[PDB]
Each structure stands twice: as C-alpha cells, then as structure tokens.
C-alpha cells in the first residue's frame, strides 16, 4: 500500500509541464489509442491512466510528450474562435425595428428561432421539430 501510494508518481511524471496540442479521435482499447494531432498527420499512442478516460470521445484538446508525443493530460477548449460573448463589444444594440417594418419579412422567422431557443418545452411537446438553422438570403 505504501508503494501504490507512489502511484501518483506516474501522474507527476506523465503531466510534466511542456505538453503540446492534440485531439481525441478514438481508441483501439483501454491504454491504447490513435489520436488526431495538429501536425496534420496522425499518431497512435497509449493513454495516461491517471485521467478520466470518459472525457470527450468525439473530439477534444489533449497533450503529447515532445519525444513520445503521447497524452499526459487534457486542457480546456482553447481556439481562435474569439470571445463570442464579448458583452457590449460584440453587442450590436440595434433597435429590433430595423430598416423598414419587416413585420413578416423576417420578424416571424426570428420569432420561430427564439421559440426553438427559449420555449424549448413548446418546440418539444408539440413534436413540430423546429427548424435546424437560419441561412439568410436576399438581394444585396
């Protein structure tokens, strides 16, 4: 038992400090996987047992040893998608009444989008399957 307590030494060694980018794609089995790497190519390596194996099976951001290029930890999502919710900075603050009445021109479509977004229970009980996405189209 006093030795298996040293089974945080494996964690310490693995984690290290200089970890690189990665992406979780799938695993051959436990303690075995093939990853998706930023290097454009793919390499398959083992896993870091000292982790929540059930993290993100589809895709994520994992690490790799400079030489071994193997996951030793998994950081949070960090991308160049920018601060989407930039509060006032990314906030148009535009009067709903925009360039003309557009009372059914686009108002009803926006209302349907808001009903799928906020009244989720409503677009759910009825079973009407609200639309998937909004792609604006019209004269330049």
């Amino acid at each position: 038992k006093r030795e298996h307590l040293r089974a945080q030494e494996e964690v310490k060694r693995i984690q290290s400090v200089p970890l690189v980018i990665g992406q979780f794609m799938e695993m051959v089995d436990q303690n075995n996987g093939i990853v998706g790497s930023t290097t454009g190519s793919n390499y398959y390596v083992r896993i870091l047992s000292t982790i929540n194996r059930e993290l993100l099976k589809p895709s994520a951001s994992v690490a790799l040893h400079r030489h071994s290029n193997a996951l030793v930890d998994v950081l949070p999502p960090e991308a160049d998608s920018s601060i989407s919710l930039l509060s006032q900075s990314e906030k148009p603050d535009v009067s709903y009444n925009d360039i003309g009445g557009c009372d059914i021109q686009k108002q009803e479509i926006r209302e349907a989008v808001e009903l799928p977004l906020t009244h989720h229970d409503l677009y759910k009980q009825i079973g009407i399957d609200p639309p998937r996405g909004v792609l604006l189209y019209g004269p330049p």
Binding site: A112, H119, L122, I126, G127
Partner: protein, 91 residues
C-alpha cells in the same frame, strides 16, 4: 426517350381531396391535436394544391399554437394556417 431506356413510367398527379384525407392522417398524426379534428372540411378547403403544401399546412398549424403557447392546436389553428398556406399559394 428511346423506348428501351425508360422501362416504365410513373407520374405523381396532384392529389385531390380523396387523396388528401390520407395525406392529412399521415401529416397531422405526429401533432398535438384538439379533441375532435374535423379534418374532412379542411381537406375540402384544400382544392388539391400538391403533395407538399399539405405538409406545410399541417406544420403551419403549430405556428399559431406556439404563438399562444397553446397545448394543442384546435381545428381553428389548422384552419387559420390553411389560409396562410393558400395565402402564399395565391401570391
């Protein structure tokens, strides 16, 4: 159009009321109706538009029902949405 190319031909004629009844029974089957439907009259109001306009009308009915957060679109809501579908049909 060579006779040996098209082995057989099948056309999709515009459904009539006799055909729209089953179309309605299929389309509204997934909706939350009101006790008592009376879809026969509505299909009568449907003057054989197409095999898709019925789908929108059935879907469009839920539009008003959501607009009032109603828990079931009664024969009034489907009737109203029928005009909106035909409103686009007449444009």
């Amino acid at each position: 159009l060579r006779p040996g190319r098209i082995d057989r031909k099948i056309e999709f004629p515009n459904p009539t009321e006799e055909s729209r009844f089953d179309i309605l029974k299929i389309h509204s089957r997934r909706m939350n109706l009101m006790r008592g439907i009376d879809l026969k009259k509505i299909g009568d109001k449907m003057n054989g538009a197409s095999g898709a306009e019925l789908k929108s009308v059935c879907t469009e009915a839920g539009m008003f029902a959501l607009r009032e957060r109603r828990i079931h679109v009664t024969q009034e809501d489907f009737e109203m949405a029928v005009a909106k579908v035909m409103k686009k049909d007449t444009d």
